[PDB]
Amino acid sequence: MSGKIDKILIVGGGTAGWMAASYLGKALQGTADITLLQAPDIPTLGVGEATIPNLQTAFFDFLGIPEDEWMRECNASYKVAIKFINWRTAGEGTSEARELDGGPDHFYHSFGLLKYHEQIPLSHYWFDRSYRGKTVEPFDYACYKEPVILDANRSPRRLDGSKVTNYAWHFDAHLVADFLRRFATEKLGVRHVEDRVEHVQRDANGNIESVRTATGRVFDADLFVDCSGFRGLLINKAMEEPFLDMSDHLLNDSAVATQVPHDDDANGVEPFTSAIAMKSGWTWKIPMLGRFGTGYVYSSRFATEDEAVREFCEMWHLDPETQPLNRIRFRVGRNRRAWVGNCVSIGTSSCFVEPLESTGIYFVYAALYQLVKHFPDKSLNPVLTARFNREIETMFDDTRDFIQAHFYFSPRTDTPFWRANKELRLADGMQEKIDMYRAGMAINAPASDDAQLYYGNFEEEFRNFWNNSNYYCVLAGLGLVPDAPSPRLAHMPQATESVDEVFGAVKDRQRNLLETLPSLHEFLRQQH
Amino acid sequence: SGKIDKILIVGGGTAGWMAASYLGKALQGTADITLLQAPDIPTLGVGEATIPNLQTAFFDFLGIPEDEWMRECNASYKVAIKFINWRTAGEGTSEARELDGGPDHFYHSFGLLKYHEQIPLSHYWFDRSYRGKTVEPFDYACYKEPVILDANRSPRRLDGSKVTNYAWHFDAHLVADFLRRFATEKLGVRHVEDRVEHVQRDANGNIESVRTATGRVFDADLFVDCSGFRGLLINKAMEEPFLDMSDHLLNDSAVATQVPHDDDANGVEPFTSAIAMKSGWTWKIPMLGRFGTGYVYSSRFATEDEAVREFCEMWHLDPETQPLNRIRFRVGRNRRAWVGNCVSIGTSSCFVEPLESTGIYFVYAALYQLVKHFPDKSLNPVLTARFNREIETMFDDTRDFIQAHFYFSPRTDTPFWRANKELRLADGMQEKIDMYRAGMAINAPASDDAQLYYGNFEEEFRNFWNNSNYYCVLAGLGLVPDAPSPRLAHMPQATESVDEVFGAVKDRQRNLLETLPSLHEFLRQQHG
Numbered sequence A: 001m002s003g004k005i006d007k008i009l010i011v012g013g014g015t016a017g018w019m020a021a022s023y024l025g026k027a028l029q030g031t032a033d034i035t036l037l038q039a040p041d042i043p044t045l046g047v048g049e050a051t052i053p054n055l056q057t058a059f060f061d062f063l064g065i066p067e068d069e070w071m072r073e074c075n076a077s078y079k080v081a082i083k084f085i086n087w088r089t090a091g092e093g094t095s096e097a098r099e100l101d102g103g104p105d106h107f108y109h110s111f112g113l114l115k116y117h118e119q120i121p122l123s124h125y126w127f128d129r130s131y132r133g134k135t136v137e138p139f140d141y142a143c144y145k146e147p148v149i150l151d152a153n154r155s156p157r158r159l160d161g162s163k164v165t166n167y168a169w170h171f172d173a174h175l176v177a178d179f180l181r182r183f184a185t186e187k188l189g190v191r192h193v194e195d196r197v198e199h200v201q202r203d204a205n206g207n208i209e210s211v212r213t214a215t216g217r218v219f220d221a222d223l224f225v226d227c228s229g230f231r232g233l234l235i236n237k238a239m240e241e242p243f244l245d246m247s248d249h250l251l252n253d254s255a256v257a258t259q260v261p262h263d264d265d266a267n268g269v270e271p272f273t274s275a276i277a278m279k280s281g282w283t284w285k286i287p288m289l290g291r292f293g294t295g296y297v298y299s300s301r302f303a304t305e306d307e308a309v310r311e312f313c314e315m316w317h318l319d320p321e322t323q324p325l326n327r328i329r330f331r332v333g334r335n336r337r338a339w340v341g342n343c344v345s346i347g348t349s350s351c352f353v354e355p356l357e358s359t360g361i362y363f364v365y366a367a368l369y370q371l372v373k374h375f376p377d378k379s380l381n382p383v384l385t386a387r388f389n390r391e392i393e394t395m396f397d398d399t400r401d402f403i404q405a406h407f408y409f410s411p412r413t414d415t416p417f418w419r420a421n422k423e424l425r426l427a428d429g430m431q432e433k434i435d436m437y438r439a440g441m442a443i444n445a446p447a448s449d450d451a452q453l454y455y456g457n458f459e460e461e462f463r464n465f466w467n468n469s470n471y472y473c474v475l476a477g478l479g480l481v482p483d484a485p486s487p488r489l490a491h492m493p494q495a496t497e498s499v500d501e502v503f504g505a506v507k508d509r510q511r512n513l514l515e516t517l518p519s520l521h522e523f524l525r526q527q528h
Numbered sequence B: 001s002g003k004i005d006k007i008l009i010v011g012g013g014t015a016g017w018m019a020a021s022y023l024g025k026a027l028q029g030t031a032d033i034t035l036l037q038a039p040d041i042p043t044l045g046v047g048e049a050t051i052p053n054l055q056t057a058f059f060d061f062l063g064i065p066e067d068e069w070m071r072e073c074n075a076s077y078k079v080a081i082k083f084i085n086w087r088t089a090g091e092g093t094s095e096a097r098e099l100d101g102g103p104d105h106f107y108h109s110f111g112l113l114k115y116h117e118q119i120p121l122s123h124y125w126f127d128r129s130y131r132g133k134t135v136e137p138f139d140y141a142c143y144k145e146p147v148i149l150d151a152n153r154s155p156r157r158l159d160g161s162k163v164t165n166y167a168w169h170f171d172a173h174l175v176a177d178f179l180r181r182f183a184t185e186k187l188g189v190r191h192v193e194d195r196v197e198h199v200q201r202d203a204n205g206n207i208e209s210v211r212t213a214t215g216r217v218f219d220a221d222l223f224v225d226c227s228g229f230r231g232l233l234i235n236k237a238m239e240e241p242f243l244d245m246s247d248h249l250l251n252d253s254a255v256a257t258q259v260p261h262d263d264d265a266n267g268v269e270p271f272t273s274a275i276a277m278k279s280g281w282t283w284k285i286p287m288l289g290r291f292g293t294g295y296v297y298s299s300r301f302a303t304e305d306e307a308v309r310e311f312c313e314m315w316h317l318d319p320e321t322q323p324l325n326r327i328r329f330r331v332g333r334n335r336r337a338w339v340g341n342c343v344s345i346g347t348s349s350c351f352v353e354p355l356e357s358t359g360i361y362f363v364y365a366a367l368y369q370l371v372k373h374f375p376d377k378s379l380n381p382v383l384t385a386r387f388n389r390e391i392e393t394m395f396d397d398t399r400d401f402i403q404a405h406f407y408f409s410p411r412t413d414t415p416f417w418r419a420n421k422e423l424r425l426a427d428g429m430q431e432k433i434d435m436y437r438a439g440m441a442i443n444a445p446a447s448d449d450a451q452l453y454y455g456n457f458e459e460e461f462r463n464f465w466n467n468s469n470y471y472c473v474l475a476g477l478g479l480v481p482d483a484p485s486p487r488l489a490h491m492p493q494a495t496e497s498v499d500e501v502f503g504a505v506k507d508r509q510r511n512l513l514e515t516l517p518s519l520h521e522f523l524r525q526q527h528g
């Protein structure tokens, strides 16, 4: 028919489902009846979720929820960066960084944007100096103030509350989902129904007419949102939309995870997520309050589930026979089309990639934002659907490419896994970026180096999600550098001379913040 | 292999001297630049219209104040392009015909449509227009400019304060002269007045040297072709094919002149006029005490004599005595703007009728990209390929936008107008139209802050033709969405509170109309 969408049914009630319910409930408030169908699942351990800055500005701010309100109810901690440990040295899976060129084998991928100097990213000046032997300091320590304060577990905020850097959050997803469930049902009028989908009825146009549950209830709506996770109950099962496996770019498809109690008083809390390289994958460490979530993401192609359990438990000194563990098999890739007919997939039902760069939750609300932007009426204009699908496919594929580069450019050749990664091919779009990088060009340089604008305007960030800063942190961090300095620098003697103070400013902030900032633990004590 | 040491620019018109200035400034003291230009019959100052970033991206880069160059170039101000008679049948006249109770004209002003609850004002306007809530045209409802332009107001108060975004009108010859003085006197650019007779290339196909009529031989590491439509280096020497694009643009000729004007009796129009004709359109570019004008037409629909006649008749000029410039130009772009060690800048690179004042912009936009992708003597292929991609998109998007001005005109009164409707829009442009009809914005700006936009070239270049521009032209011509944006039916609070936004515009139109001095008034002061 025609007329606006009157009823929406969300199938699936986890993080994605209740985020969808909250975002749509907020966006269409009072002009659409929303029902979320939810069936009980086997409970799992809170193994932790890491996020990015726009979670607050693009999601919680949109809902009208203050950082302090949701943080306290979700027992959240702070994330200032992802610390990559042992990606450049051979060896077993260990929590301790090995030695590399006189220092621990780690590098940071921090938030924020590299400063521009005479229209050129600081990255280019750093490399120019490194290349000409004027420096041996790593890219991250030279261009970011964060590495130094993170090495000392400092808080991203002073005791008086003032923030000194861009940061995100670490939390148990289950708590956020419960928080949102209460918010959506209590504040936004979303209807929660506890039932299991038994049958999906489609019409002759291939659209979903209704969903019938195991109790015999029939739920019809104008638009259906699939938040059923890997099963893709609607988008794949009912709509039969093909899923594109991308194991030709990503070898990791499994994980063994758990949660470990932690004495924050004795050891403090790390203001960062750790990405610890393993023999057949990598392990995440996500610090929360009084405990940390950790999971070994690996490739079933190079390690059996039991070998992964052993490697994982031994690294944390846990009993492989008694430790509570979540054994997961991921569905890596994306649907050929995220939205088909009147069925929009949101969450893992849509796409999934290992949490190497904290994009899981981002993918959920980035998509919800794109859905509302391309919101249809009952005629389901195909142009809205196609453009939405294009945005989603690009969002995922760029991430897929970026993550693959973490493994493709690691210098490690010590296990079949690391060696195999180098035998895969990068997508053409990614290879073009590397060609540009090697030629000394910036990759997706931000329009402005103003981080407040970037993280404060979703449209601005979504169009430049993976920017030059991100690419340099990871590529240079791993050891991939340009074949030679940007040739235009040889024509800018005054700029390459005055940049001295730009590097000096970072050094002063590194020193000042290190001497004045409280530890993350200290701040959390006062705060929570 | 060493930096670029010598640069030879062939051609000394507007493009050539802008190249010498920009490059002389950008590479100051690190490259020797010589501009080689032949002396030949100058043309009439038929006038050139520009856009806001001419100052922020070009003159500001050179370190030249707006006051300094515009007074030495006797320039006037441009606040918009006024399209006249594009919707009504008839002969080519300077007077707007009547349409729906008013004159047949619409404005394409500078600046950005304001965002209301994350949605461009254009969408709220159409929603109301579509629901019979209003009959006011898009431009008058969403822009303050239209009514002050109708009264020939100045973009700045007598005290100098700026009340709107504006650009300039000037005789290009004067600007070229100014830049020649600047580059030679202040940037050390060597000027040689001679004619190229022979271009010698090496075994790699790169240019080795150029020999002149007097027997002089000039060598360089990089050659900039600013020879105009001849493409002496890029097309003739390097043999790079020029790609004609008359399958999108029928206009390929023009008859132009300069007409004396009594500013005291008539004031000065703060806008460029684009007057629809029987087989093309005519530009009117107001300057000091005169205006440049030219009939752009299609040689396949009107003869040179017919064009001269139609043109002279509208301005009441005598065909037999009025000095006239008759030109037949090539429309399109080179397959590649930069090949080997030869970079084309200006009309030697590409050209499209001046319907949206992009001619000069194309020059410094390309110069900006050349410096960003500046090579050393090894001429890294990647830098060249990327530069070329930037140029082709810059041009093709403009080509598409201009074609739409003709394709969507409602006129069917002459072979020309009817023939435009039988051409094919490029796939990319068709997708944009599909989106537009679906109620979607086309290239919405990341922010509605015009200052960020016009103050940051990277920002504008990535979003050069934005939703504001498409709505001005498409809606102006009468092409509107099939229905309102489906989103608005879900935002009652937004659609209610938007009247305050429309009201704010109304107050601005009122106050400015009442308080602003006429353009002529301001011009007397700022100039005389």
Ligand SMILES: N[C@@H](Cc1c[nH]c2ccccc12)C(=O)O
Binding pocket: A052, A053, A054, A081, A082, A109, A110, A111, A112, A357, A358, A359, A461, A464, A465, A466, A467, A470
């Ligand atoms: N645009 C994202 C990029 C990003 C994703 N994951 C990250 C992890 C660490 C640092 C940056 C990122 C941001 O700046 O937030």
Ligand SMILES: N[C@@H](Cc1c[nH]c2ccccc12)C(=O)O
Binding pocket: B051, B052, B053, B080, B081, B108, B109, B110, B111, B356, B357, B358, B460, B463, B464, B465, B466, B469
């Ligand atoms: N980004 C350009 C768009 C543009 C080109 N030519 C124009 C003519 C009129 C109005 C806008 C334009 C600007 O706003 O300057």
